Amino acid sequence: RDRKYLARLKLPPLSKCEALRESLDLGFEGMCLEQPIGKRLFQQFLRTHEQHGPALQLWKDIEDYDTADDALRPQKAQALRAAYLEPQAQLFCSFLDAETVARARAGAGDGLFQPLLRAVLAHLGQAPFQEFLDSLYFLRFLQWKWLEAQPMGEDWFLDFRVLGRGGFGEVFACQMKATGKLYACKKLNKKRLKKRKGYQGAMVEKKILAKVHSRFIVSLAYAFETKTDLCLVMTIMNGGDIRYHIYNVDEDNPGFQEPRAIFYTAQIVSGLEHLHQRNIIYRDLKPENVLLDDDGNVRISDLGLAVELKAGQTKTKGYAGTPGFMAPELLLGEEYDFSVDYFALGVTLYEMIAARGPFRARGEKVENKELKQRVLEQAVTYPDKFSPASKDFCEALLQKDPEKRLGFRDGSCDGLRTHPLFRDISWRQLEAGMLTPPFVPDVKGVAFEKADTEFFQEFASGTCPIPWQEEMIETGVFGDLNVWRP
Amino acid sequence: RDRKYLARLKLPPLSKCEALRESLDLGFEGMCLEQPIGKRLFQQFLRTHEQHGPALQLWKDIEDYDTADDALRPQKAQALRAAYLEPQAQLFCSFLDAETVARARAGAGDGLFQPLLRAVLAHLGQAPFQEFLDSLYFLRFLQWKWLEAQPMGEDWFLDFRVLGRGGFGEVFACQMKATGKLYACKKLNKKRLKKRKGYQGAMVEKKILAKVHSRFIVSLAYAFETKTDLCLVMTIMNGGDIRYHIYNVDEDNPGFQEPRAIFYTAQIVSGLEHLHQRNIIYRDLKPENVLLDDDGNVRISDLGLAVELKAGQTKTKGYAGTPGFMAPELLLGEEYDFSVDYFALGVTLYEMIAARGPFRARGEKVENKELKQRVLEQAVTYPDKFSPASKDFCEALLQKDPEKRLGFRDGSCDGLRTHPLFRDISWRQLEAGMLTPPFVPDVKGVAFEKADTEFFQEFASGTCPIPWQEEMIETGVFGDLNVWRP
Ligand SMILES: Nc1ncnc2c1ncn2[C@@H]1O[C@H](COP(=O)(O)OP(=O)(O)O)[C@@H](O)[C@H]1O
Ligand SMILES: Nc1ncnc2c1ncn2[C@@H]1O[C@H](COP(=O)(O)OP(=O)(O)O)[C@@H](O)[C@H]1O
Ligand SMILES: [Mg+2]
Ligand SMILES: [Mg+2]
Ligand SMILES: [Mg+2]
Ligand SMILES: [Mg+2]
């Protein structure tokens, strides 16, 4: 971990933060719930003001309950009602209207104290937040926000191994010099990008990865440019992709035992739900695009083919994707939904179990025209490796007509999580990354004009707030720079 | 210690401090050296900024040297030159011009690193201070300054014993309810004060005690008013006055053994020097006005007869004082100096040793006219209880002609500290209250008009900055209210 760079992270004089005190969203949930550092500084304020003690403690306890092993839930719920909900107890929460306290008292299932937590946060967003804004803790948040906006480009990162190769350049495992955090840096050589008309794709990816924060999508931390390249510094995923893992590990016995395959399906499904909730269509889901991190958790990646539906827009058109994964509606030149992605999910689960595609034989290579016809009118065949459940799930995803295809209804995939295939999957624990993964790894003549440079600048948009604050915190740097009296 | 009142000490929202951010002196030495809390907060800033580390540590070390037992001085000076003055050492102070470093390197006596310290503080007053002002630490100082200005009057103090009786009311030992700190509250019934024309005297005292900060003058902490009284909350002195101690403890063998008497004289002399340095003439020094605290240290008190010389004024006129202590020049109706006080010092040391006055016999009571003549023309007589030194000192203070009287020359009493009488007195340790004391204890028809109410308001000027910050600190309240992360 480089000391010269560590030393460039130093909180500024308050006078330097006056400007970005206007260019900043004051919004409560925006800054105190979503930004890791704001949340940390706002909980600190709370901890040092008696009045708010109970609310802070309840809040903290709820998140503790939401992350507890199922075994400990009953008692944590017990102590929680005892500690904040009996009008006796010291930490009773008088700001909770009795109707809310009643419900919280009578415990349902998963989502038990969710409506409690919403009431607590609704409370904190009023005076407590308004007080925070009038406290030193808020001024500290502005200092941090200032350091976050400072330039941290190429000289800040040390490449030290190739993770893979891609259309426009290599992908390196690299270190952020100050903090020593490990990332993946994806390079896109500038000249090739122009030569091959790939600006739209490159940008769609950067914007998606920046504005999306899921443990199942790879996450963008930084975006800058060099003499030669555009760069995307993002979550490092060191455990190879699903497709590698299907064919290349167990060579003579290709495939996944159902449970493992289901685990991934479940994680991937969570990846889609997030994209679709933000009106994004992936358009490119497949084994080769799904990566494993060191622990054996999985994230979707590679998003050059994605599209963002403009607000109010529900359907779109356009040929795009990988042959053998594009769904019927797309091929028929029709306008399509998120449904497209679910068809791809199905092809994917299928491949994970059968170590082969549904639409061709091993080595069988056909013309596009023919592959198209198979996808459109060929009924899929399910060998014995499949279990009733698997088979049925794949049938529901691979439904030729999107109107009849298992997918995304009512702003979620809840309908889908229901399926008998996910019988042994605790969605709570999965969504929170707290389940044990079933498997743990071990050119000539281009001239740059005005429009080219503009594009580059718009691409190199600098640091991504949430992931940077995460890094500062995980890496210890926040604790160190934040001390008041040593 | 009262919890209801403790709870009224809570730092305010920054917005409430905007106003007193103009009505405040920014001055460096004024806020960071003289105000205990500003100093504490400014050292905190310093501790949390690497660059300033060396300067802060030097500063701290010097005060440590200035308070060390004489036994430890040599080595502390050693480690000090080793740690900040050799260009090698980590904590070397590059901001010290070499000429200063040279002098500091070659050690004299008492006052060794004084000119070093002045250079360190001169440094801190520049950028470091200017940075402080742009830091959160300065904003915290504004919060504290806000709490300090909040109303803390009679309901904030619990009387619980009479310490003594005075012309206009009693003096009580009382507790500051919030902090539990013990004070003396001196009451002046409002009606009597008016009836007997005592407003000037009462005020002269309050202003003197407020604007003066010495360990040898009693110290004013608060000044407020009740329905019936004006109030002065001040240092508590529980060990009786010198005059009580002269006659009333050892009844049949009245007096002080020289060393004890010298100790007091030395303390008292320090009391005068402060008063004179601020152009104040005491006019009322005497055994009955000199108090003992619990440890047996001594402070001068009772200041209704004092006068403050307007700036540029060097001499004054006016009959005032206690018969038997007023000096010749004063009696002769002439205009007088601080010299007056030194004559009183002399009568005082004399009484401490002889258990009698120099000018009359036991029980001898004469007319003013006669007592005057004795003071003016009677030569003093020194029994055997006196040592050459004592006798000589008293002769020098009791000199009828102020032009020839030992006293206050060149802005100090250094000339006087020189005397052979103080041969065994370490002035350094005395001035710092770190010596072991030789003895350790165990009405009708008055109507209030406009002018009366105005006077009262001007008198009840509230809390005294320095002593309040001291209290907050000693009493632990500052530590508690100042925490950043618990
Ligand atoms: N976040 C990452 N962590 C580790 N390796 C990666 C990461 N992203 C990509 N790679 C490696 O780089 C390859 C190409 O990256 P990708 O973004 O898929 O390029 P393209 O979009 O040009 O196909 C991947 O197959 C993978 O092996
Ligand atoms: N700070 C104090 N601590 C303890 N006792 C005190 C203090 N101030 C006054 N007293 C007691 O109360 C008496 C009267 O106080 P004083 O200020 O001398 O009033 P006055 O000016 O009317 O003489 C003193 O003689 C002393 O015994
Ligand atoms: Mg790829
Ligand atoms: Mg791509
Ligand atoms: Mg008195
Ligand atoms: Mg008086």
From Swiss-Prot, chains A, B:
Active site annotation, chain numbering: 284
Domain of life per record: Eukaryota
Modifications the protein undergoes after translation, according to the UniProt entry: Farnesylation is required for full activity.
Compartmental location: Membrane; Cell projection, Cilium, Photoreceptor outer segment
Sequence positions that bind ATP: 163-171, 186, 235-237, 302
EC number annotated for this UniProt entry: 2.7.11.14
The keyword Phosphoprotein appears for this protein: yes
Subunit structure: Interacts (via N-terminus) with RCVRN (via C-terminus); the interaction is Ca(2+)-dependent. Interacts (when prenylated) with PDE6D; this promotes release from membranes. May form a complex composed of RHO, GRK1 and RCVRN in a Ca(2+)-dependent manner; RCVRN prevents the interaction between GRK1 and RHO.
Topology of this chain in the membrane: Lipid-anchor
Gene: GRK1
Protein name listed in UniProt: Rhodopsin kinase GRK1
Signal sequence, renumbered to the chain: none
Membrane spanning residue stretches: none
Domain AGC-kinase C-terminal: 423-471
